[PDB]
Amino acid sequence: HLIGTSSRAVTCHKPATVSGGGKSEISKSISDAFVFGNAFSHDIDSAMDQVQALFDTDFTNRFADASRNGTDHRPVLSIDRSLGSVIKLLTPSIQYNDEYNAFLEGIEPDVKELAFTVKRYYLPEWGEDWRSHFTVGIMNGRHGNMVRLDGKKIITNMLRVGFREDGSWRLFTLRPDYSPAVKVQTEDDITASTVTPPWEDAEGLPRKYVTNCEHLLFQRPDDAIHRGYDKQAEFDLASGTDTFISNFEPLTHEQARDLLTDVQAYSEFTKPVRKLIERVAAMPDDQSPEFWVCSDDPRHLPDGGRSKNPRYLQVRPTDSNPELTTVADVAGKLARKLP
Amino acid sequence: MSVVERRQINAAINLRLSLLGLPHPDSDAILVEPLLARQRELSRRLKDRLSAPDLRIQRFLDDYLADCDEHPQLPRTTLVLDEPGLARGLSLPVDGDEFHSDIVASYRLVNGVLHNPKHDRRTTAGVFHISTGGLPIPQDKVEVDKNVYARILARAFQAPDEELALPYTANLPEQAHCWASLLMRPTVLPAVPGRTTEKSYEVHFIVPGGLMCNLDFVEGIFGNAGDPYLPENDASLDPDSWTGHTGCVILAPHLTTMTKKSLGMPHYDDATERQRRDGQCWRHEDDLYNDGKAFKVCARDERGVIVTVIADNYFGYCKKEVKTQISYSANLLGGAEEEHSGGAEVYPAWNLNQDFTDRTPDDFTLADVISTNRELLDVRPEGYAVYKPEPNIVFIPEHSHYSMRTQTISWTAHGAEQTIKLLAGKHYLSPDGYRIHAKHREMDATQWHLIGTSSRAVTCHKPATVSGGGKSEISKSISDAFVFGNAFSHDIDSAMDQVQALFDTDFTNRFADASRNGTDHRPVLSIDRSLGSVIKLLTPSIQYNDEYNAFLEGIEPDVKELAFTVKRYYLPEWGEDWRSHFTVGIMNGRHGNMVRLDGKKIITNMLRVGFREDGSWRLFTLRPDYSPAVKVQTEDDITASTVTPPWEDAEGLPRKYVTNCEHLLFQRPDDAIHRGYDKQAEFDLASGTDTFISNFEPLTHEQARDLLTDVQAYSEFTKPVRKLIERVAAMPDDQSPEFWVCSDDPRHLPDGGRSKNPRYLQVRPTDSNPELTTVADVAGKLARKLPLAGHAPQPIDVVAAGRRNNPPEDKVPALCAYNPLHYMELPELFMEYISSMTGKSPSTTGAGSEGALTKGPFNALPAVYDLNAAVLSYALTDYDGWLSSAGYIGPNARVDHDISMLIPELFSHMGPNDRNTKRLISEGYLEKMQDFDFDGHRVLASRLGYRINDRFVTHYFGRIFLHPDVVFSEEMLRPELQDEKIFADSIDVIVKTHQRVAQMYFDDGTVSLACPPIRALLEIMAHGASAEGWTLDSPEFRKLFERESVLASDWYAARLDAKQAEDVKQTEEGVERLKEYIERPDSGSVSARLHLADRLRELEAQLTYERSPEYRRSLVGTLGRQPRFV
Ligand SMILES: [Mg+2]
Ligand SMILES: [Mg+2]
What we know:
By secondary structure, the first copy, chain A, is an alpha+beta fold. Helix content of chain A is about 25%, strand content about 20%. Chain A has helices spanning about 45-55, 85-90, 100-105, 110-120, 230-240, 255-260, 265-270, 270-280, 315-320, 320-335; strands at about 35-40, 135-140, 140-150, 150-155, 155-165, 170-175, 190-195, 205-210, 215-220, 245, 250, 290, 310-315.
């Protein structure tokens, strides 16, 4: 699919944030927080009948301003109607009548989600027949509930917003047209800033401009002890050769050869760490370096546990990914008619 | 291949072209030149001297064609391909990557070599021509006059220059024109210890240089026998491994422009009805031979020399001709068969979850395994051993404990508990061969479990299977067919409440044998109770009592599956709070329905069994403990087999032993055009660099770069093809090879479409995964208490022929009366084998026929030879004839090959007694097909034999599927419920085809050669009754097929008398051959090197034994030899 990225940056500043308030999280991409589910329907044929009736609805007289009614005649599956257009069309709005907003409230959330799904995947090659591409599977002769597109299950994107009291996740579906925002990190821990009138207009509203005083970030991969979870730290710690690492346990060649055949723990690491364990395990005992660090083994404390403050100097995201940084700079300059 | 290997082949090629005086590239030479000048001069003094194999061929032609206008003489000077690889290097220009002639387009590829012949497809209509003057000609073949054959064979050696041009020199200032020859030794009789020596016949391919790619093709399949001029390669000087038979194949596409008139064939007015039927006559003087269509002409008789000329270069003709000549040698040799079959040694496997304790019987100990093969074992101090020829095989003491959680194997030895690490990639063999290995799931590399594979092979054999009947699927692994779904629950709380109630059930008083009650007190979630135990615990069984099986039948299917899921994933760490570990997701504030283990969705294994009428897949859940059976492929297309008393017991019931005559498999990846679908083909076509590929489109570097940037198509390929496209895209324009082949782009046809016959030569699975083949052989020998070193063949266990079915269409006949699995007694089985009906090419009377045992187009001999030996291989062995269904079950239940994949898994989970058809019938698992009236006409449905019922499905498919009672609907088990008319029409088509095929045996008179069983069957098929008035129901007719009848018969002893007489004749000929050769004065040097002195004494010892009545008694239980060929 296509991703559209606005060139209009909304630069966010997260100051004066206590420990555990989420200072570094503001520049961390939300794509890794994605949870993937499927679409479930207790009765797909009764659901597609309401979707078909919803498609056959005359949406032209929906606006609160009378001058706007009778101007938009695009059907829902029209090529001239984007996926976002259909989402706004079926969302109660101030611009819509009470006649229409009351009608929108009466649509089942199961039906609204299926209507968006048909819109997302409709191909004009299908013509009038779109129901034949949306079925439910039959398992052991019994009808299933997971909606399928040409046999294949439909995959939905979700994010967690808090936990229930019983500990289970509160998952919520993202809009079909939502895509993770692109973040260009500008600050992490030590920030130098200034306030001036805007550099492009001395008579404008003053602004704050910041830079990062640090060229390497002193990261604490707390949850890297859970193999496969902290993907970034696992890549940072395994794929480098000059990484400054602190509060980790020094591991030996034989320890890497033992972990290589620890099939459970080995299969849980992300691919960068699995590669690192392979390379170390293949080293003869006379080949240097003598030690290596694994992302899931912090420094063993003499008491018995392990250090809760593992650390390493991380290359800044804008330097490890200079291309996307250039794209944002070029795009942001076009947005402001700047050379 | 490496650049070094390619320069060595080119160097060997240059030496041989220089010996023949032919032009060759100019690229130490001072060193070999005096040797070359010497060998040339020795060669011109002996010029036009024929090698020993060519002498047996030429002497045959000179005598067989003694009364003809022409007396064809073989090419006296040829380019002899005495080493493997030469034909590969010669089939492409030395300096270029592309070659074009009027018959082939050849390309050097990144992933191998590509050869597109003039015709992309094989045909059968009027293709097999047999010369008169030899053995009888079947009714379906084209009859060619002996004189016309001589004129054809004479013109076959008059080849034009363009056809003689080697591809090796196509870009050189001067080209090399020559004939090329390749000697091969294809297997005809397999080796069975103490029973038969592996015997092969000898074939000599003699083709013009422009057909070099055909020599590379057959050399890869059947091997290279070397320089035929050397005594080491003379089949007659080692007669114990020779069948006494010689084949010859000439390829001459230029024969397609012969006129019938120039060949002296009669005009249509002067020709007989057989000649008019066969096109062996002309009308206009411009009429081409065989009306321009492809053809091969063939001459052979009882002497054992078959000479075939093929006028088409499509590679299928070459391998099928070798198959024909192997079948020709088998019928003339006796005691052997050539089968159009696939097969595999199938070892059943189970998912053993996390913990398993070894259960080795008392007659199997590691102490005995060590002392029997201690020169092969490195005994470790902890008390286990490692197989030194393959260190990944590890022999574990009996009664050991396997744990996946702690990842250990523990036992007691040397008065101490021993613990070793359970490694992934090792094969832990119990003293009886039972294998434990660690594996992670396909959809979750972090989910690990133990796999247990039985060392007790159920060796499956799939013969007489028409095209589309699933012949190759018998050996394909069912792993890639797995469909993965999730666990579903309408209400997980109420379901877990019923599961907890189920766990707190008193299960100890469950048995029908009341003395077995009160003995098992293990809870459901006990460590001492296995996952399979819980499944057997909740599965209705005849071992349980009436009240308990009713209690089980009252368990809802969801609760039963959830109970198994709780048992599958339960951990003793959880204690008694297992409920909290199973929940459903809350999405948008609404409770979901996917059962989740600690938050993660549970993944379930499923298989498709057919399609609904709307096209949707019929998915069915597998038992948690089901794992795909291990399949060691043994056959595919060309099978040499024999029937002897078991090699471990001369008094035992005779068995069949098979081997594959092919070493590369000529695969046709039909569905490779659907990217990602055919994972095996896509891996084979992309991961290689030496693959022989045919009927694919040659692709350029630029086309790889365009495909690399086509995100949709590129992402749909499997990773191997994606990696190949990446590599070719990175290639500059100055880097060779210039071409490559993509698995989804077959050869583009001149008429717009693409070829439907894409082909490549596949390395056999037993050769591409040699470690697993070693594992099965070691495990199988331990299961039989045999030493690890030595040939230990496994007999066939199950014979499950496949059958293609189809619903009726406007011109296609109804062939859809069979249900998933039929059992046929010998009479009904051989009406199927004789007919081999298929909906493809349906004639005017019913349906089409592939001939007897599907060898119709691959048999130069009367089919009745095969039928006599085939009927004996079932009567002498008590082999049951099974018949699986493919394509359709009735007119409306399409199943494709879903059931073909299920048959090996089904039988592998059935023991010997389970598969015994006499108790299956008497216990109500097999229903006899009954005749019925329809529109006043009696529908003879009884010819279909027996079919499985739902009791068979519930009991034996219940060992694979979680809910077996729903895998097959009633319309699928009793297909007449779909449409009675279409069912009656199918039987009518079957009965009418039985008539047409059996009648051919009367038109050509070969029915007079049939044994009494086969003879009366043909009379019944063709006329409605035998000469004695017998129908299929008559007890006198059916008793002819019983074992005690054939053993006590005179026609069987006559086959055993003929067998002993022919073996004595071959040996005494081999004795006179060696005596003569050693008594030559100049042959003393080779007698010392080849140990011909010892070999002659072995022959004379073999001759005395073959003459004794002791050898005649050992022949009882074998197929014998055809007593008369006319
Ligand atoms: Mg700080
Ligand atoms: Mg075949």
